[PDB]
Amino acid sequence: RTFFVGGNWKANPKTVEEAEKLIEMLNGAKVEGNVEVVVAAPFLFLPTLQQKLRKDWKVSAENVFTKPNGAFTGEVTVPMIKSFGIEWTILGHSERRDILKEDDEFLAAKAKFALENGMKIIYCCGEHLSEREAGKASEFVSAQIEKMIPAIPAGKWDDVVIAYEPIWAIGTGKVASTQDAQEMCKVIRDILAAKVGADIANKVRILYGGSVKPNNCNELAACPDVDGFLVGGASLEPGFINIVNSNVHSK
Amino acid sequence: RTFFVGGNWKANPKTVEEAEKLIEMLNGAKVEGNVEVVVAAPFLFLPTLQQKLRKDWKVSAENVFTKPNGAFTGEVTVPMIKSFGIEWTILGHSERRDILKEDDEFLAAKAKFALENGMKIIYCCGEHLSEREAGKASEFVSAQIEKMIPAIPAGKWDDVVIAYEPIWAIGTGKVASTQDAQEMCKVIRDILAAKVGADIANKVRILYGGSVKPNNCNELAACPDVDGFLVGGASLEPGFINIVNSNVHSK
Ligand code: NA
Ligand code: NA
Ligand code: NA
Ligand code: NA
Ligand code: NA
Ligand code: NA
Secondary structure (H helix, E strand, O other), X not given: OOEEEEEEOOEOOOOHHHHHHHHHXXXXXXXXXXXXXXXEOXXXXXXXXXHHOOOOOEEEEOOOOOOOOEOOOOOOOHHHHHHOOOOEXXXXXXXXXXXXXXXXXXXXXXXXXXXXXXXXXXXXXXXXXHXXXXXXXXXXXXXXXXXXXXXXXXXXXXXXXXXXXXXXXXXXXXXXOHHHHHHHHHHHHHHHXXXXXXXXXXXXXXXXXXXXXXXXXXXXXXXXXXXXXXXXXXXXXXXXXXXXXXXXXXX | OOEEEEEEOOEOOOOHHHHHHHHHXXXXXXXXXOEEEEEXXXXXXXXXXHHHOOOOOEEEEOOOXXXXXXXXXXXXXXXXXXXXXXXXXXXXOHHHHHOOOOOHHHHHHHHHHHHHOOOEEEEEEOOOHHHHHOOOHHHHHHHHHHHHHHHOOOOOHHHEEEEEXXXXXXXXXXXXXXXXXXXXXXHHHHHHHHHHOHHHHHHXXXXXXXXXXXXXXHHHHOOOOOOEEEEOHXXXXXXXXXXXXXXHHOO
């Protein structure tokens, strides 16, 4: 599996001027090894990112709606994104599931519409503190993945990347270890193998989407079932290239 | 009060090419009388709209988040919008309150943050079918407006426009009359007068945000408390200019 790093800017930076400075920095970074790099940014900066970002990397939306267009004030759709030549979207980020109240049925419909319309997706999942504390992580995560599975059209698993977020370690007073990340990525891979088969499970990139920094990326990358990262705050920083380059420690 | 027409493209068109064709059409329209025209478009088309739209009209976002930036994957913020020179946002559209589950507390926080950060807002309200059928429209609408009121900083009412949407007439099998529109705009004006005073009530533009087409805009515009329109589907059509030009029938 080709190591995969997505840089999620989230709702940052504040200005188009800062977004352009950041793009210029990414454009000069020397990448080592072999890695697929995708950069996700706010809708408003997506045109400038598509125009100016280095051509060997790909741009991604941070969300899309379920419909092609229509009476959905405030929403951006797949055709709009695609009309810019943009090929990726993130779906189901914890921040959207939590703050914006996106449920599994909403997200399943997004994944289905996105893939049926030629998009590639980074589909996020992960359990909260009570399920982690109860030792029920795999069950929670399996239910999410089981909702996702029927959305994927035949022949589209090559266009699917799954990111595991240890939500239990986000603003809870608890931290995730390197072993935690390996364990949950493996859980996901096994759920896929059981449900859709080993060939698909062996090809789908599963990413660690907890806290990833220059000080932990090489050890994380080395876990056998960790195929890359959905990077939060470090994507805004020159340390993002350390993370991209951690691929040389993954085998 | 200067007549005010906002063109809400909603989640349309599907492509940047269509958005550019539409902008070129708007750019050639001959405006009559005196009217303040604002055009709201999907986040992804906002840069091209700001760049290319006629300078005597203003661009608007269709939504914004409550925060300046941060861990809010998928969301666009006021500073981002402002970094393009964009001055307006719509807030609280029925489609967002309904489909995207935006509640009054969320919307109040958006209005407060937006205005405190120099934005001008088009704040939407309106009652559903059961409150219309029960004859309880004014009470429902008053409660919405009463939630909005504390969000408006001192000296910012000049940066506030209110749009009334007859949600009871949207996909319900019921249609709104011209008299309905006048009556509810007046209801809103009176709530403002009672709560914040006649000087403010006499200056705030209150818009009809139900179905507005070339075949009803002149009669609607002529209602004394209707100060303009938040236009849906006709904003995508050459008929939008008829609606903009209906200002000559308002006094
Ligand atoms: Na267990
Ligand atoms: Na395929
Ligand atoms: Na690995
Ligand atoms: Na009554
Ligand atoms: Na003012
Ligand atoms: Na009028």
